[PDB]
Design a binder for these strands. Structure first.
Lengths: 100, 126, 100, 115, 136, 82
RNA sequence: GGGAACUUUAAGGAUACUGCCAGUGACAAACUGGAGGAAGGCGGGGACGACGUCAAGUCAUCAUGGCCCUUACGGCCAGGGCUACACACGUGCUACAAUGGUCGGUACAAAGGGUUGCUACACAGCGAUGUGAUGCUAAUCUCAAAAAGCCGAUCGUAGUCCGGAUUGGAGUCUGCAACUCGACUCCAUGAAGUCGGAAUCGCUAGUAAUCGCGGAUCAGAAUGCCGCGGUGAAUACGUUCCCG
């Protein structure tokens, strides 16, 4: 019943999808069964920034930043599975959390 | 037996249509308990009334999101799709009635510098 | 901003850092119900006897590059003038122009 | 009927009629009626004498007209004599609780005075 | 619009009698989107009229509307068929307001019943409009 | 106003001066900038020079002043009409 | 327990092109109508601002040529002011009521925020709130009650059971500290106002109107600003007149 839960967070959904694909392929190689990847709801934060130095309240830039989240479940681990996951390299821009 | 999905202004309706004798239930409630204003009930009942078939089917309906008008419209759309999924030849009559179309109108966003989607603050030359 | 105002902000931050633990202990003693009312009054007097800059309500957020005191955006630590320029040339990760 | 020295309307409910006495609001009226035992929807016209004196006894327990007006006047006069900030505002007939006076002070000031 | 001709919007018939006249009258009655209140008022008025006399509401209403319908607006300009119904329902709405019955549905029912016999504030509205119509 | 569970607020130096005078019986005014200190019953019978922004105004404390702040008796703005 | 159907979540794809039919146009561009289709002629909205104009705005975000001050035009502190008040204007909010006010019962959202934070629940208080205590680093727990809506009772056109300014008294919370100069709660008070002159503003559809909800700034302090959904209209014959 040793279940491994992996949560991926990023600011770039292509990067996060690449990482999720790499992880699921690495696990399927060692032969443990996988569940996911499951996409969690995205968070969106918006900002309004005045562009003129002194006075134009109607002249503004609207920016945003998104946080993408992916969930991966590992069931029936093989001994090689955890070692392969730990030897997996850390891609820049993607945050990975592993819970047992 | 047959299934239909309806959508109208952020409302979504799941409709299960079978053969029987006219029971109707929405979110484990009757039509009169669920909808208080009678025009919503007429909107819900329009498809079967237009077919003269209100005593030959059982309807099991779940609905979520939106307001009363949106939910009534979604339920009507779902009933139409469920009837079409039961008898294909019925579609011309429902399309003539106008029940097959998915209404796409939705709330417009507020815009920078305006009070609303279109309303503009009061202007003065002097 | 002038250099004096920036140094003033630095001095207040240093004072707040220096008096952090004593103030928290005093407030805990004040909010403690088991202690005698004489003890609570004494703690109130000691708290009122600290230097003014020890209190955090006198700190003002300023831009990390220019020291501007208006338009702060806690998330980035930059005022609007520098935030616009830094975002629009790509040095802020994940931030893009927003449309919806 | 005459209660506390004024004639309250007889064709209204008691909770609305008792509010016509200075110093009694809706909350106090329903409190008095609940304390005595009359329903809030009973009109004054269908109230017998005994319940009328029962209401009068309860109204005797709160400052209503002359005592209350005298007390308010004394409070204002004390501030004006003392000469604190609120007393100065009362003397000059200006807002007392910190509102703006550059515009929008017409309730205290009265109608506009032409230059 | 300096080049275009914009087609007149088409509104749905009412769910109860399937009458576009009733639907447009309801839209004229409604204020700020309270269609439920407007429906209650209009349906109550028609029900009251039907109780007073056993006549079918759709032709009852359209007959009274034809009687109140003006041929000339207010200084005579000439108007189109839609304008006829427009100002007819406009005047019909106002008279019930200054009537004195307790509920708006009852007030409107009284106004319709009295206009059906020519004794309606909308009726003298039309009469005055006509009296200025023979002016020019 | 200030919550009763905390009690009145008086500046420590002003309280020290007042209690010193009252333990003694001195009569010259007590000069202060503490416009925010509350008037306590011990203040009665004393003259306090309260700052008002540009000057020190003398205030002779009476019984009814108890419960006010010192600044209420030293106005800060000057107005005489338009 | 279980299922992977449905809703949803979120990545990748398909689809619309006058493609088909009937007339027009000119023998074209284009224009008119019909079928199928979720959608038909640019389906709706956003970002994107050509060559140029106004010695337009910003030396107080910042940088910078020149000029000026140097025991002071630099620097440190406490108190006060930016909140004044015979008046005039701009932008808003709340009303003048019955398509409404109050009371009781009962339904339906979207988006967003939360670890020096949001708090289930119990107790205390009329209430703002306080004490104990539980979950949450969040599609997991929480802010949170949507409001207008529907059913019933009452009020019966009154300056009122409309309106909620101003003032007296008593409190809570943040904060070293609410006098000048905070927000909120309770009792009392109950102003103008009965739809607004000459004149003038916004809007062509999920729009106007109306109803509630969230966030940045922020110890505390929105009727402003930026967003979200609910209910949901009327009218356009035309280019003389006004403006660009």
């Amino acid at each position: 019943n040793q279940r491994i839960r992996i949560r991926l967070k990023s600011f770039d959904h292509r990067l996060i999808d690449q990482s999720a694909q790499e992880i699921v392929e690495t696990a399927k190689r060692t032969g443990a069964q996988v569940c996911g990847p499951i996409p969690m709801p995205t968070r969106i934060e918006r900002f309004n920034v005045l562009t003129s130095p002194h006075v134009n309240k109607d002249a503004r830039d609207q920016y945003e930043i998104r946080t993408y989240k992916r969930l991966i479940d590992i069931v029936q681990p093989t001994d090689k599975t955890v070692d392969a996951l730990m030897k997996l390299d850390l891609a820049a821009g993607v945050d990975v959390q592993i819970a047992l | 037996t047959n299934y239909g999905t309806g959508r109208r202004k952020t409302a979504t309706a799941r409709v299960f249509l079978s053969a029987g004798t006219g029971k109707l239930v929405i979110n484990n409630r009757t039509l009169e308990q669920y909808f208080g204003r009678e025009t919503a009930r007429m909107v819900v009942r329009q498809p079967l009334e237009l077919l003269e078939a209100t005593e030959k089917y059982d309807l099991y309906i779940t609905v979520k999101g939106g307001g009363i008008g949106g939910q009534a419209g979604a339920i009507r759309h779902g009933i139409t799709r469920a009837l079409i999924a039961a008898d294909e030849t019925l579609k011309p009559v429902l399309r003539q009635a106008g029940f097959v179309t998915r209404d796409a109108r939705e709330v417009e966003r507020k815009k920078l510098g305006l009070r609303k989607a279109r309303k503009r603050p009061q202007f003065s030359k002097r | 901003a002038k250099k004096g105002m920036i140094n003033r902000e630095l001095k207040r931050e240093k004072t707040v850092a220096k008096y952090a633990a004593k103030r928290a202990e005093l407030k805990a003693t004040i909010a403690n119900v088991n202690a005698s009312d004489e003890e609570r009054f004494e703690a109130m007097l000691k708290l009122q006897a600290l230097p003014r800059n020890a209190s955090p309500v006198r700190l003002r957020n300023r831009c990390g590059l220019t020291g501007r005191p208006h338009g702060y955006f806690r998330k980035f630590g930059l005022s609007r003038n520098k935030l616009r320029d830094t975002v629009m040339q790509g040095d802020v990760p994940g931030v893009v122009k927003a449309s919806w | 009927a005459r209660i506390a020295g004024v004639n309250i309307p007889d064709n209204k409910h008691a909770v609305i009629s008792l509010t016509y006495i200075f110093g009694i609001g809706r909350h106090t009226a329903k409190n008095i009626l609940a304390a005595v035992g009359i329903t809030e929807t009973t009109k004054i016209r269908e109230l017998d004498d005994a319940q009328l004196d029962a209401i009068r006894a309860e109204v005797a327990k709160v400052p209503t007209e002359g005592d209350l007006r005298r007390e308010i006047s004394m409070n204002i006069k004390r501030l004006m004599d003392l000469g604190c900030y609120r007393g100065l505002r009362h003397r000059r007939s200006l807002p007392v609780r910190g509102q703006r006076t550059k515009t929008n002070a017409r309730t205290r000031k009265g109608p506009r005075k032409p230059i | 619009p300096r080049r275009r001709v914009v087609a007149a919007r088409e509104i749905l018939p009412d769910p109860k009698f399937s009458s576009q006249t009733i639907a447009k009258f309801m839209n004229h009655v409604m204020q700020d989107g309270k269609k439920s209140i407007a429906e209650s008022i209009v349906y109550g008025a028609l029900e009251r009229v039907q109780e007073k006399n056993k006549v079918d509401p759709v032709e009852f209403f359209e007959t009274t509307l034809e009687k109140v319908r003006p041929m000339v607006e207010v200084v005579p300009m000439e108007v189109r068929p839609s304008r006829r119904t427009a100002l007819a329902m406009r005047w019909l709405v106002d008279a019930a307001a200054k009537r004195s019955e307790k509920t708006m549905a009852l007030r409107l029912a009284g106004e319709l019943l009295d206009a059906a016999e020519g004794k309606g504030a909308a009726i003298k509205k039309r009469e005055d409009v006509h009296r200025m119509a023979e002016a020019n | 106003p200030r919550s009763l569970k905390k009690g009145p607020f008086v500046d420590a130096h002003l309280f020290a001066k007042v209690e010193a005078a009252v333990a003694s019986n001195s009569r010259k005014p007590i000069k202060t900038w503490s416009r925010r200190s509350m008037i306590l019953p011990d203040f009665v019978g004393l003259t306090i020079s309260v700052h008002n922004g540009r000057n020190h105004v003398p205030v002779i404390v009476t019984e009814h002043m108890v419960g006010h702040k010192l600044g209420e008796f030293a106005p800060t703005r000057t107005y005489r009409g338009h």
